[PDB]
Design a protein around this ligand. Sequence first.
Ligand SMILES: c1ccc(-c2cc(NCc3cccnc3)n3ncc(C4CC4)c3n2)cc1
Length: 276
Amino acid sequence: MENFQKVEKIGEGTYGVVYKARNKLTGEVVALKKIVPSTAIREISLLKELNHPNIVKLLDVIHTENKLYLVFEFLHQDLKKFMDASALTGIPLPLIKSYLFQLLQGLAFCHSHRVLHRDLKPQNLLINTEGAIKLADFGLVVTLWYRAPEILLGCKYYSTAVDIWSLGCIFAEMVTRRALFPGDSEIDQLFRIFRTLGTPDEVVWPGVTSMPDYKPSFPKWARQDFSKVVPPLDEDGRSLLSQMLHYDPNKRISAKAALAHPFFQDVTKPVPHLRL
Ligand SMILES: c1ccc(-c2cc(NCc3cccnc3)n3ncc(C4CC4)c3n2)cc1
C-alpha cells in the first residue's frame, strides 16, 4: 500500500491473500486483501454501506493498475485458529452460544438487505478480546465442507438459506470439535451429508429429484439422530441445529426466526481466552 505498510500475511483468501497492514499515515492497523469487472466494482463498493457490529467493516476499495485491494477492519484471531487452539478443552458452551447468537444477528442484518455471504467457514469468522465475533469477506482448493446441498445439487438461484446451512455446520463443529461434513470432492460432500441426514427425497424435499445434479442412482441412506451427531449438545441446541440443517431451503429456519429459538433463552456474552 503506498499508503500502507505490510506487516505480515495473516491468511490466504479464496480471492487472494490477506495481509495485516499499517496505514502509513493514520497509523491505523487494517487487513488488506489483494485480489477488474465494472460489475465487480459496483457490487463491492455497495458492501461499504453494509455496516453492523457483527460484520467485518469494509473500509475502502483500491483499484490500481487493474489490481484490486480491499481494506478491512483488523481482528486479532479467526475462528479456525481459535478452534484449533481450543482443541484439547473445547470452546465453553456459553461462548459457543454467544458466538452463534451474534452470527445469526449478522446474517439477519445482511439477509434483510438481500445480501448473502455464500461462503461462510471458520476462517471467515473473526473474533476479538471483547467476546465479539464477526462475519468477514463476503463472497460475491476451496472447502466444500460448509456448502448447502441445494448448491451441490445445481440450484442456480439459491437463497439466504445457504448461509444458515453453513452456520449450522460451523455450530456443530464448535460443539464436537470435528468438522460435520468434511467432504473432499463434490460427490463426497453430498454423500457425507446424505449418510448423516438421510438421502433426500420428495417426502422431505419436494422438487429435489428435479434438480440439475440430482441422480436417481444416489444411494439411499437412513437419517441418524442428532443425539449421535452432536453429543453432548442439549435438546434446545439439537432442535435448533436440526432446523438449520433442514434439506428444503424453504423450510430451513431463517436467521431472524433462529434468534427467537428457546436455545437462546439464557444467552450471555462470555469473553474468550485469547493468547495473541
Ligand atoms: C484466512 C484466514 C484468516 C483470514 C483473516 C484473519 C484475520 N485476522 C486474524 C489473524 C490471523 C492470523 C494473524 N493475525 C490475525 N482478519 N482480520 C481481518 C480480515 C479481513 C479479510 C477479512 C481477516 N482475515 C483470512 C483468510
